[PDB]
Structure formats: structure tokens, C-alpha cells
Amino acid sequence: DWEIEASEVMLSTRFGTVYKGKWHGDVAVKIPTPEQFQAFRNEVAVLRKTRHVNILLFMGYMTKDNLAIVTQWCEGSSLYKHLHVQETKFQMFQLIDIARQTAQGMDYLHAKNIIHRDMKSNNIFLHEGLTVKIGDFGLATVKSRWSGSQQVEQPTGSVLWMAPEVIRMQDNNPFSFQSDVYSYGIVLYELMTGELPYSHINNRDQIIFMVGRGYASPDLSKLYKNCPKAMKRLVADCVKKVKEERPLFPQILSSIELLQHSL
């Protein structure tokens, strides 16, 4: 179907680190209970549902040796590496374009009832400095009529992009469209400030507690003066502490398109 014979895929470099390879060109491959098969199935099932220019292109799966998922090899760096490591100087129209393409892919995902659940600038790749590619669907899931019935496990990722209700873990399933929106709002903060949130806090458990308790939130005064007021409102609206008050991606797209036509 979409299965790849293990003898064809070649590995080259190194749920872990890197794994660049070669299967009909440059590709990216990934490294045992019925739970992990559900992990493979859920990621493969989500990936198989995506065919969009702003979504990392799933290409095939494997079973032999170690399980694997094959995707395209993006040429370039991640948005995280562009913003916090290489300090690539983007012009404001490029920053708004990155914000638009990301919202475009997210809107495509939600329209097919996909929750990424692990959105962060590390998982947004700038394919050749032009096209946003959203990747790393290892924690993604499809919304269903039993999602609230299942007890999710702790995300165990980076707390910087986790919505306060995802941190508190008081409900069985805190993830939703709005939790993806919050993560997207933090990505906007990175774009429109050049900094990660909570620069003054060098303590993971302090972030977990204060953000979960609502005692801490991104510092909006760090936004560029170059940043339009509509964009500043969009960041603030996306990181609202109240889940229901956060706009959905159709509203995000409308807001960006209006301020882009303006510019």
C-alpha cells in the first residue's frame, strides 16, 4: 500500500536525533507493545490524511528491523534554529508570511480533525527558506467520539509551548484545537520578539507551576515596534489563558490576510 521494502531504504546520518537517508532521493526516516503499534498507526493514519504544501510530506512506512516512517528531507533549518541559533534576520513581511503559512497548514490539519499536540518552532521547517513545513506528528491524534474517554499521558515535551490546561492535566484529555492555537501563539511570540517566552525563568518546574496557575504569561512588551498592532492582538488572543476565548485557525487566517493586504 504505502509500505516500503527495507532493502531499498538507505541510512546515512544520525524519537531520538536525526536519521537522514535516501529512498528515491533525500528522505528522512525514523528509528514494542500493542501500544507502540497504536503509536505507529496513529502517526501513520494522521500522516496518510495529509496532502498539503505546508505539511511535511509523508512518503511511506516500514516494519522490518526497527519500525520506521519515511518522509521528505527538508533543505534548510528549523524555525527554532533560524530564530534562536543562527539569528537569521527576517524582515517583518517574511515573519508575517511564516505566520500565515503555519496557520494555513494548521487550518488544513484541524479541518481534517487533526490535533498536532506538539506544535513548536522546532517542528516547523523552513523548506529552502521559502515554504513552511509542519512535521513531527509523533504525538498527533485524530479527534473522535471517544477521545474524552481515553486517559492521555503527560506530554513530557517542552513546557514553553504547552497551553495552561495541558500543563494542569486536570481533565482526562486537555488537548483540543485551542491547545494547538496556544502553541501557535507561542510560535508567533517567537517570530514577533526573536526570543523564547519566560527568558527570566531558568527553572522548568517554575514554568510548569506559574503558567499552570496563570501567574505567568508571555511578555507582550517584548514584541517588535515593527510588529503591526493587529499582529500584536493576534498573539495576545492566541495565548489567552481561557481555552474557549482563543480564536480558531479560520479566524487566524482572516486576521493575517487583512493586515497583509494593508502592508
Binding site: 534562536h84 492535566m169 522548568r204 518546574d205 517554575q206
Partner: protein, 294 residues
């Protein structure tokens, strides 16, 4: 308190002498022997023949910051104490920071606890002296706190030594690593208050309760643990099992207000420390018997 006896002075001089034989550390000079946990490998430095522990840390940071972390880690060359894990060097290769330190064949007290179920009170008395003296050494001689005291960061060896490790010697590394299912953080540090060695004392008292009763003593997700630390009263030892001096010792370590909490000077002359310091305990024998070493 920072005075060394004859045996500790000879052990420290012998480590420095063995450390002289170590030159520039390169990725090729090492041979993997086993994995101590995570990542940390028991490795061999082929030029010197020394067994070391090689911790690897992966960070996506600017190269300038990475270099400053390596420079800040050099301060560990001055942290020489019977109660501090020794340091060989730190370098960068393949995108990962390598920290090469003294190998402790007894592992961490987190590991010792799993093989012991619970650690006896007299053994914990010798642990308390080591942590207190190690925290005192870091404060008096280097003006730094630990920032991450917990059973996994108290290492032991078959010679009966008890040493602290993984303290915050590098400000850039602390900031970079700010991105675990339990928590030993003090209430004041969770709330964003300024903090001091007082928060390490809380972390020690919490670790002592865990090792004494053989159970992490809070309560559950991570946030509810942090909510419990800040908004609920501290834990305490059971009343019937342990001595009154040991009970009073941990209670003065677990006072939520850091100013009213006991400091190092108070803890050093506490009755529990006076008693355990005078007690002759065979920690090396207990350790090897508990783990199954030779």
C-alpha cells in the same frame, strides 16, 4: 567543617595526581564500557587508562553560548572536596557537550534505594553530613548553591565516600537546560522568589524522607505535585519508626519559609548531626553488601 582528615587529604592528592596524567580530552580517546543510565556512560580514557563517567548533553544553542558553557564548566577544576564528584574535563563534539567526571562505582542513592528498599537512619546520618559539608564547601569556597539536590545526584563509592554532583556551576548551562516526572523543588523556587542554599536544604530534607521511608513523599501529574509542594504542608517522617533527633532534623529542613528554615550552620551543630558524626558506621561495608559489589 571544611577541614580534611589524613585519609581524605591523601585521597584528594591521589585524585589530582591521577588527573595530571589526563591531557586534552578528545572524542577518539574514549572507549565505551557500559551505560550507567540517563545520557551517562562508564568509559575508558585510553591514553591515561582511567575509568571515567561521560555525561552527554545535547543543546541547540548558538556556538558562542556553547563555548561559554565549556569555559564556565572549567570552574569544576577548582571544586576539589571529599564531598564533590571530581572533574576531568568538558568538551564539544558531534553536537553534544561531553562532561567527563570521576566514576562512582556505587552509583546514585536513587539506585541504592531501589536495591535497599529503605536506607537505615544511621546510614542517612552519614549522608546528611556529606550533603551538608558539600553544600558548605560550594558556598564557602565557590559562592554557588547546588540547585538540583536529590537522591540521583548524591553518588557513592566502595571506599565509603559520599559526594554531590550535577550542581549549577555554569549559568549558561542552567539557562539552556530550562527546557522529569517528580520534583524536589522548594516552595519559594516554584513561586519565582529569589532563592539560596536554603532551597537545597529543603531538597535534602525531601530526599532524606524519600530514602528513609523508601517512597517519594508527596501525594499524580507534575503540576499537581508542584501545587502540593506550594499549597500543602511539608511531609514528615513517621513518628514511631525514627528517632526524635532525626525527625526534628528533617522538619527544620522542610519549613516552607526559607528564612525560618534552618541554615547550614544550624544543621551542622544539630543533635542529629552530632550523634551521627560520633557514631562509627561502616558505610563502605553497607554499600557493597547492599548493591552486591566486591
Amino acid at each position: 567543617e571544611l577541614e580534611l582528615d589524613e585519609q581524605q587529604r591523601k585521597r584528594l592528592e591521589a585524585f589530582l595526581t591521577q588527573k595530571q596524567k589526563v591531557g586534552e580530552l578528545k572524542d577518539d580517546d574514549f572507549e565505551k564500557i557500559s551505560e550507567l543510565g540517563a545520557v551517562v556512560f562508564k568509559v575508558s580514557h585510553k591514553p591515561s587508562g582511567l575509568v571515567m563517567a561521560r555525561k552527554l548533553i545535547h543543546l541547540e544553542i548558538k556556538p558562542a553560548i556553547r563555548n561559554q558553557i565549556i569555559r564556565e564548566l572549567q570552574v569544576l577544576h577548582e571544586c576539589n572536596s571529599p564531598y564533590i564528584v571530581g572533574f576531568y574535563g568538558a568538551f564539544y563534539s558531534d553536537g553534544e557537550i561531553s562532561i567527563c567526571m570521576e566514576h562512582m562505582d556505587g552509583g546514585s542513592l536513587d539506585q541504592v534505594l531501589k536495591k535497599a528498599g529503605r536506607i537505615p537512619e544511621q546510614i542517612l546520618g552519614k549522608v546528611s553530613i556529606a550533603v551538608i559539608k558539600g553544600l558548605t564547601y560550594l558556598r564557602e569556597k565557590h559562592k554557588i548553591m547546588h540547585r538540583d539536590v536529590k537522591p540521583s545526584n548524591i553518588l557513592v563509592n566502595s571506599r565509603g565516600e559520599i559526594k554531590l554532583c550535577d550542581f549549577g556551576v555554569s549559568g549558561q548551562l542552567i539557562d539552556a537546560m530550562a527546557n522529569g516526572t517528580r520534583s524536589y523543588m522548594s516552595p519559594e523556587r516554584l513561586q519565582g522568589t529569589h532563592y539560596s542554599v536554603q532551597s537545597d536544604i529543603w531538597s535534602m530534607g525531601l530526599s532524606l524522607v524519600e530514602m528513609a521511608v523508601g517512597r517519594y513523599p508527596i501525594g499524580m501529574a507534575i503540576f499537581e505535585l508542584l501545587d502540593y509542594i506550594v499549597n500543602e504542608p511539608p511531609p514528615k517522617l513517621p513518628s514511631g519508626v525514627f528517632s526524635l533527633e532525626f525527625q526534628d532534623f528533617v522538619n527544620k529542613c522542610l519549613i516552607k519559609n526559607p528564612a525560618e528554615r534552618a541554615d547550614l550552620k544550624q544543621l551542622m551543630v544539630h543533635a542529629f548531626i552530632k550523634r551521627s558524626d560520633a557514631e562509627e558506621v561502616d558505610f563502605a561495608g553497607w554499600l557493597c553488601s547492599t548493591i552486591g559489589l566486591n
